[PDB]
Each structure stands twice: as C-alpha cells, then as structure tokens.
Amino acid sequence: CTSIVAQNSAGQIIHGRNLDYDMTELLKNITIHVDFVRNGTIQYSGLTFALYNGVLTGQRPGEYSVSLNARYSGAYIDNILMEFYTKFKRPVSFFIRDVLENQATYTEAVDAFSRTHLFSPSYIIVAGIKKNEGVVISRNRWSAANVYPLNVDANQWFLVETNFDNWKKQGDDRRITAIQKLKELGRRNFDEKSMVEVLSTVPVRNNLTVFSTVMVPGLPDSADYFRQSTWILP
Amino acid sequence: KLDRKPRHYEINLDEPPSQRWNQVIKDHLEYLPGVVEETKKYIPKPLQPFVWWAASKIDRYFTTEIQEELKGIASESGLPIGEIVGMNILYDVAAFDRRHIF
C-alpha cells in the first residue's frame, strides 16, 4: 500500500493510492467502485470488494478523501493477541465508513480519526480542499495518534506513507521512489495526471498492486472523477 | 485489457440493509467461494478456532444496520456468515503474508 497526498502551487490537493495485496489476482476480479446514495444524493463513495461492505479508500465528494494503510511493526508474535483484540474492539473498515457518513468536513474527519481510543495500528491519510489540508494520521500501539500535516510554506507540499516504520520505513523502495518522483515532477503544475505517473512508477506499482486510484475531493465533479479514476492493474 | 476500471455500483442507503449488496454479490457470485477459501488460509492456524467462535457473536461488534448488511451478504452469497464477519474484521489478513512466522 502506498498513499500519497500533494498540494500543488495552485492550491489543488490530490490524493493518490495504490493497494498492494498478497492475494493479488483473486481480488482484482471483485474490486468495485461504490456510490453510497441517500434521498437521491451521493453521501460518500469508496472502493471495496465483493463481500466487504466497509470502506478503506473513500471520498466525501467536495469535502475530503481518506485512505487507510495497515501498519506492520516487529514482534508480530508478541502482539498478535493485542492486534486481534483491537481489530475486534473497533472494526476498522466500518469505522472509516461511519466517518464518511457522519463527518461532513475535512476538519471533522481528521478529529474523528484522531480520537484517543483503541484502534488498530495503521496510517490514515486524509486530503481536503483548503490550504495544508493534507495529513497522515499515525494510529499507534494501541490508542494514541499522531498527526503530520502539509506545510506548503515550508516546502512540504506532499506526504507519502506505506506500511512500516523505523528502519523498514526508511528502506521501503516504494516510499523512496515515490518521494523521488514527486520531487522530479515538482510542486508547480502537479495535477492528477502527475499522480498517475508517480503511482505507476516501479516499484510503487509492483507485482502485488491490485489497483491504483486518484481522488481530488476539491473538484466540482469529484464524484464523477473518482468513478472513472481507478485502474485495476494487469 | 484497455478499460480496466472497477465496476461501478450504487448502494442505496434508503433500502433495507439486507438488500443493499444483492446486485454486487449476484454479479461476482462466481468468484466469492474461491476468495473466501483462499483468504482463510492467511489466518494463522492456531487462531482460526478463535476467529470463527468470536465471529459468530455478530451483535457485539457492529451496529444493527451493519449486522443486517452482513447477514444479507451471507444470504445472497450462500456463504457462512461467521467467515464473512471474520474477513471484514481482519481486513488486512490476506494483504501481507505473515504465515512464515508461524
């Protein structure tokens, strides 16, 4: 998994997301895009898979978009019980969907994802519409959260996150490549097609990549864009 | 080949929750049994007996709305609900292969 958020010079915020899944080819056949509608209006959209009614890559059209990366640290043996415990205590995919349904603004969604409570370790990447409205939320072991927002005035116009931390994070070829590619393309004139170039660079795209998607919640037709922006890889 | 976009669906929140995913399940019914069988293999074997036991207690983890959706999904797919609940809770169990640790 690779989640990217970038704000260009014009102020547009782009959310790119690659989903890497070990059970790659079977999942491609059941990858779907969904519009959740109520009273004839799209409340929120998301990518999911047949049998899964939660959302891990989704958008509140016009307001914000969100993607969740699993977070894998060492000592999987030592902590497996605690991992299963928090996953049952607060189901992750349905928590995300509940936020998309009941939180209307970027600021409201970021606070909901930052509440101090049991939550499975993960990275929640949220993209907005206003300035610096792009954040990586680090859900830590096992109830705290840290936020790392955009700082365009400090020349911090993009955020990239995958699945790891500590040494393994700094050595992730997916994360390193995406950061190099964003710097090559540069902040100015960075658009959704630039995000497509980044997400398609090897090894950001790799043998386990199920789909690549781009979300721009700030667009006046963000729902229409998201409905055709996802690519199931061959 | 050239158009590799995911199929689009509208999930009507005004419909009863047990009926919302009918069309999605009907369109992918061919693939669902193999996905389930292959996903379960990623759960560590020592913890599989616990997952199935805990997953039957569906009323403890989800709102009534989500409960009815999961039950509707299990009815339309013809697959045991405990397995469907387990996969949804262990959202990343098949994302990152960790069976070599066991």
Ligand SMILES: *[C@@H]1O[C@H](CO[C@@H]2O[C@@H](C)[C@@H](O)[C@@H](O)[C@@H]2O)[C@@H](O[C@@H]2O[C@H](CO)[C@@H](O)[C@H](O)[C@H]2NC(C)=O)[C@H](O)[C@H]1NC(C)=O
């Ligand atoms: C998508 O599905 C195809 C379809 O294959 C089968 O379809 C169903 C009837 C059911 O039996 C599924 O479990 C099967 O997958 C997949 O193509 C098959 O891939 C497997 C891989 O080992 C192979 O054994 C089969 O011979 C393949 N069948 C054909 C007709 O080619 C395919 O792998 C899935 N993924 C993608 C990306 O298409």
